[PDB]
Design a binder for these strands. Structure first.
Ligand SMILES: [Mg+2]
Ligand SMILES: [Mg+2]
Ligand SMILES: [Mg+2]
Ligand SMILES: [Mg+2]
Ligand SMILES: [Mg+2]
Ligand SMILES: [Mg+2]
Ligand SMILES: [Mg+2]
Ligand SMILES: [Mg+2]
Ligand SMILES: [Mg+2]
Ligand SMILES: [Mg+2]
Ligand SMILES: [Mg+2]
Ligand SMILES: [Mg+2]
Ligand SMILES: [Mg+2]
Ligand SMILES: [Mg+2]
Ligand SMILES: [Mg+2]
Ligand SMILES: [Mg+2]
Ligand SMILES: [Mg+2]
Ligand SMILES: [Mg+2]
Ligand SMILES: [Mg+2]
Ligand SMILES: [Mg+2]
Ligand SMILES: [Mg+2]
Ligand SMILES: [Mg+2]
Ligand SMILES: [Mg+2]
Ligand SMILES: [Mg+2]
Ligand SMILES: [Mg+2]
Ligand SMILES: [Mg+2]
Ligand SMILES: [Mg+2]
Ligand SMILES: [Mg+2]
Ligand SMILES: [Mg+2]
Ligand SMILES: [Mg+2]
Ligand SMILES: [Mg+2]
Ligand SMILES: [Mg+2]
Ligand SMILES: [Mg+2]
Ligand SMILES: [Mg+2]
Ligand SMILES: [Mg+2]
Ligand SMILES: [Mg+2]
Ligand SMILES: [Mg+2]
Ligand SMILES: [Mg+2]
Ligand SMILES: [Mg+2]
Ligand SMILES: [Mg+2]
Ligand SMILES: [Mg+2]
Ligand SMILES: [Mg+2]
Ligand SMILES: [Mg+2]
Ligand SMILES: [Mg+2]
Ligand SMILES: [Mg+2]
Ligand SMILES: [Mg+2]
Ligand SMILES: [Mg+2]
Ligand SMILES: [Mg+2]
Ligand SMILES: [Mg+2]
Ligand SMILES: [Mg+2]
Ligand SMILES: [Mg+2]
Lengths: 46, 93, 271
RNA sequence: GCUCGCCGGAAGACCAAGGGUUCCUGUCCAACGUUAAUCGGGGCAGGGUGAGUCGACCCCUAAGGCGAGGCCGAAAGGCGUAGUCGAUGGGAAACAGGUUAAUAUUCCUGUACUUGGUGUUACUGCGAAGGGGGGACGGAGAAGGCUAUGUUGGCCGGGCGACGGUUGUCCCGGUUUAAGCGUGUAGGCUGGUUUUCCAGGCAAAUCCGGAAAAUCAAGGCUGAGGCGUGAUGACGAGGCACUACGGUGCUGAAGCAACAAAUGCCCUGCUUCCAGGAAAAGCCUCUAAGCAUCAGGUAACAUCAAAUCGUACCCCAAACCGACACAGGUGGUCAGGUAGAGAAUACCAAGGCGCUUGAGAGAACUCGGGUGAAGGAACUAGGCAAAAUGGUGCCGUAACUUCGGGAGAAGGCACGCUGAUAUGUAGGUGAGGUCCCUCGCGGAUGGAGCUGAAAUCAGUCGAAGAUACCAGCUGGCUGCAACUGUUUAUUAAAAACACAGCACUGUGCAAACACGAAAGUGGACGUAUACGGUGUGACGCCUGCCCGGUGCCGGAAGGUUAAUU
RNA sequence: AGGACCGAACCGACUAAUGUUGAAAAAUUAGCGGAUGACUUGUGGCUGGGGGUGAAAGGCCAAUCAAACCGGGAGAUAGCU
């Protein structure tokens, strides 16, 4: 059975990486919320 | 011409191990721990100045630190770079 | 020309192919080629805006001269060529000054013929003139609609336009649709019918043949669910509705032309 | 350690993705390992990844992304030009041997190659954000030439056998060598050369394109493999000396030929078909402005440089995705023997494993198999399941048919081994020799040697010769759908969907239509032989009557009728 | 030549048995269909929730689908238990 998570680092970074979050207003909102909560890892990049 | 300060920084320590000693007594190569950002040319110049020997070529590699386990918490040792610097067949440091 | 395949398999039984032995067999003329990637019917929003488009063979675009504006320089036809992008055939013509160019191939044209454009060209098939200089009653193709813009009417295989009347600055044309229209007399046209008239006689013979041309399957609206199409639903085969498009507009006879800007040029609708 | 069993188109060996120390050494056995554990992918400590040539980085672009100005939008924003990113594609260069406990095309030995910078000599028209060429391209098929590789024979080293025989037509092992450099072959493509002229290639051009003459017919480009060299080397069975028993050191014979042969290479070729088969740079060439005994270009020589990052290990898996050391999933490459059409299948090689609970016993019952008297569908909703058929060659084969089919219809016969035909045939391959020439990787004869089916006749063994594995059940009537396809991931694969074909209808191009407050975009770089929608569904014979109802199309005399006034 | 034929890889999923606190939240075993094409597959890209995509089953859109998931309105409302 082929499961849903098929890892790929390039796709991971392009979809959820830091520069993808910083590219839009809503992504920057995501970053702001995660900074406010105190997350140790903002994005998948780390 | 690299400044002397940079040369005094780049070399950190000689590396001690079986492979290092074998390389010394077989291929006339010393193995050193160097700064993480030292290039081959800087290592070459530094060895030539601070040890007053002539070097043939420098080979470098980056060693990745080991993830270690110390009392409930995960720690990681730091990466470092080591150089296989080959002497010019007549120096014998 | 038109040949039937032997029924050696069920997918071949009904194939009728149109073969032209006169078409070039080599590669096309490289300097007049471009790429055109497929769209899948998707616009720049990424959404299907025309259904039933997708796949098919890769094709390269042939830059065809629809303007025919370099006048007074005779050209000779080198060879007829197959064009994937249209139903008509195209002809490679070599001008006397050394310039090569693609044109639509009119009926009867063949390698070695002379063509020429301009106000002083002889009235022969493949010659281009302003419609002011073409005798009334002639059959023409590749008709311009605005002067200097390039031909836009009667470009598909086997089509042509008839010049029925001339008065002042306008000429009345009979279009293939049976519709009469005014255009300015300064627009250019090419004499004769566009060739490959037997294009309409081909029979694809199998579903794959349509898939080769980039046509995807059509699902009848009556086979859907009500959430998908106005025709959907039913226990068994039920219709009980006036036929409409997927977006609810009635689709058997309702007229959709609404363009008051160009009504002045329409002498009589096709009917 | 010896024996046994299993895989061997994988359960062997590499690479990419993904993981990240699982790699190797010492040590420990609490927890983890479905049991014990001295063991471990477990704990602890140490060690280990070496590049001008491999990859990334880098140059160039695809789909697509972002996008100065711009256009559009209550705001947020959307689209998009110039640009700039983006590989899964294009772009310079390395091989063989040795070596570590763990790396190696990276270290060492030998032998190479690429690009660029400086310097010097020699000769010189150099110059792009521009022009041209090239790069540069499909599917199928057919050979011919080869090689990887294998087999056999020679040669070399060893052997003479636990039980009858084994000095021979006997047994075992080896018989290997690269890139590069020179040669330019089988073969593929293309006429060549010199003048003059020109509405073209945004300007120019000596380049490309076109035209006209003269002359020569052989010139150019591409090209596997072979041969020579690389290589008087390296490697090499085995032997000898040691061993700290794991292995270390020393020495080292032969190293040939024939035949068979790829799905690999010539081949991005050739032939053919229609569904008509990326882009840009590197590269070659042309000039513009400009420079002008300068710069620059070309060649030879010398010298310098080629940074940085990855490199351990797993990788059809106990290390990746599945919560697990989970009978699942996971892209590419390699591809030995005997039989076989074969990458099926059986047994094996190289190599790797026995699947992390065992020991007994030999009840019912369950699971997976084997055989079965007589009968043979009586079973059952139903021949479900099982049993059966099964190969090659030849003979033979009906209704019906759209003339292709049906058809492998049905059915039948032969099949092992040995000898002869023929001390190995038909065929394939092909040495020597001889004769030639423009002498060469040449041409013609020539047939040694090697390899080698199929058939016939005779004999012979068994119950059985397609002996195992492997490998169609067949026929008759009928409903439905023409057919190949598609579908309810995970209870429905069908008569459902699609389909080629048919019809109606819209649409004259700034098309209808669709996405979108809009700008725009798709339709389409298409133009009525086109595009959209709807219904029907190959083909054959056909498709009757009704316009009252509801829709749609046309009309506009009259009635009624909004804002407005 | 062929949406030709027989048949491995590969892609599927017709039948039966097992399993059903499974070896497995859809598999195994023996058979089965396609297997040069409307084929199959790697890498990357695009379409976003009354929206997409759909050879059309209300199928699929991260084990979720007659309207995804996450957070918020929010302690919705609940003549009901
Ligand atoms: Mg080195
Ligand atoms: Mg390195
Ligand atoms: Mg359509
Ligand atoms: Mg249709
Ligand atoms: Mg339905
Ligand atoms: Mg509705
Ligand atoms: Mg009914
Ligand atoms: Mg009714
Ligand atoms: Mg076995
Ligand atoms: Mg660890
Ligand atoms: Mg280990
Ligand atoms: Mg114990
Ligand atoms: Mg235990
Ligand atoms: Mg460990
Ligand atoms: Mg782009
Ligand atoms: Mg944009
Ligand atoms: Mg702006
Ligand atoms: Mg770029
Ligand atoms: Mg790439
Ligand atoms: Mg290793
Ligand atoms: Mg060979
Ligand atoms: Mg490795
Ligand atoms: Mg286990
Ligand atoms: Mg497993
Ligand atoms: Mg697969
Ligand atoms: Mg097998
Ligand atoms: Mg028993
Ligand atoms: Mg039983
Ligand atoms: Mg039995
Ligand atoms: Mg019985
Ligand atoms: Mg019996
Ligand atoms: Mg019987
Ligand atoms: Mg009965
Ligand atoms: Mg009964
Ligand atoms: Mg059965
Ligand atoms: Mg059976
Ligand atoms: Mg009946
Ligand atoms: Mg059917
Ligand atoms: Mg189902
Ligand atoms: Mg099913
Ligand atoms: Mg438009
Ligand atoms: Mg129907
Ligand atoms: Mg087929
Ligand atoms: Mg399926
Ligand atoms: Mg199966
Ligand atoms: Mg098949
Ligand atoms: Mg339903
Ligand atoms: Mg789901
Ligand atoms: Mg709702
Ligand atoms: Mg509230
Ligand atoms: Mg509540």
């Amino acid at each position: 059975m082929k499961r849903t998570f098929q890892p790929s680092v390039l796709k991971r970074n392009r979809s959820h990486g830091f520069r993808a979050r910083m590219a839009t207003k809503n992504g920057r909102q995501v970053l702001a919320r995660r900074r406010a909560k105190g997350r140790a890892r903002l994005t998948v990049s780390k | 011409m690299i400044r002397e300060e940079r040369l005094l920084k780049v070399l950190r320590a000689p590396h001690v191990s079986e492979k290092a000693s074998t390389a010394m007594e077989k291929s006339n190569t010393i193995v050193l721990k160097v700064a993480k950002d030292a290039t081959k040319a800087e290592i070459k110049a530094a060895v030539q100045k601070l040890f007053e020997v002539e070097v043939e070529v420098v080979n470098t590699l980056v060693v990745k630190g080991k993830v270690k386990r110390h009392g409930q918490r995960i720690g990681r040792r730091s990466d470092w770079k080591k150089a296989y610097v080959t002497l010019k067949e007549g120096q014998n440091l | 020309a038109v040949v039937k395949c032997k029924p050696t398999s069920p997918g071949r039984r009904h194939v009728v192919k149109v073969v032209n032995p006169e078409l070039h067999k080599g590669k096309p003329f490289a300097p007049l080629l471009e790429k055109n990637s497929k769209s899948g019917g998707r616009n720049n929003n990424g959404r299907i805006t025309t259904r039933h488009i997708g796949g098919g063979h890769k094709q390269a675009y042939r830059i065809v001269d629809f303007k025919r504006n370099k006048d007074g320089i005779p050209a000779v036809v080198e060879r007829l060529e197959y064009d994937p992008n249209r139903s008509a055939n195209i002809a490679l013509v070599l001008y006397k000054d050394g310039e090569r160019r693609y044109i639509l191939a009119p009926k009867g044209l063949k390698a070695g013929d002379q063509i020429q454009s301009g106000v002083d060209a002889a009235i022969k098939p493949g010659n281009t003139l302003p419609m002011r200089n073409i005798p009334v009653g002639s059959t023409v193709h590749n008709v311009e609609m605005k002067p200097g813009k390039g031909g836009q009417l009667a470009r598909s295989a086997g089509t042509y336009v008839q010049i029925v009347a001339r008065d002042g600055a306008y000429v009345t044309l009979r279009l293939r649709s049976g519709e009469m229209r005014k255009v300015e007399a300064d627009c250019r046209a090419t004499l004769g019918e566009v060739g490959n008239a037997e294009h309409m006689l081909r029979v694809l013979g199998k579903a794959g043949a349509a898939r080769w041309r980039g046509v995807r399957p059509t699902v009848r609206g009556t086979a859907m669910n009500p959430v998908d199409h106005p025709h959907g639903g039913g226990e068994g085969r039920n219709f009980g509705k006036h036929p409409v498009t997927p977006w609810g507009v009635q689709t058997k006879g309702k007229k959709t032309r609404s363009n008051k800007r160009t009504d002045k040029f329409i002498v009589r609708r096709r009917s």
